[PDB]
Amino acid sequence: SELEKAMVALIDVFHQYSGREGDKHKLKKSELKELINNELSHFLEEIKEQEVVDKVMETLDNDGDGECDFQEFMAFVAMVTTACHEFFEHE
């Protein structure tokens, strides 16, 4: 059942923050970072300092190299995870 809550769990995160200007379905350095430091204050891992995040969100910048939407963050938690969490999940 986690697959159902975890799935929408991600969506809600972006659907809650992303969508302030009007177009929605996109997140800027302020929308993502703040959110991360907002939801992930004790368990970041994928986000260390403030400067790194900017590069982090940029490392996934696929849309227009401008900001990160739902597809950019979805690939993030997945890319960052699927890679290290793979065998690094232990350490």
Binding site: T82, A83, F87
Partner: peptide, 12 residues
């Protein structure tokens, strides 16, 4: 992807 973290440039 294993130890490359797969991110891209940030961690490389």
């Amino acid at each position: 992807t294993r130890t490359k973290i797969d991110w891209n440039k940030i961690l490389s």
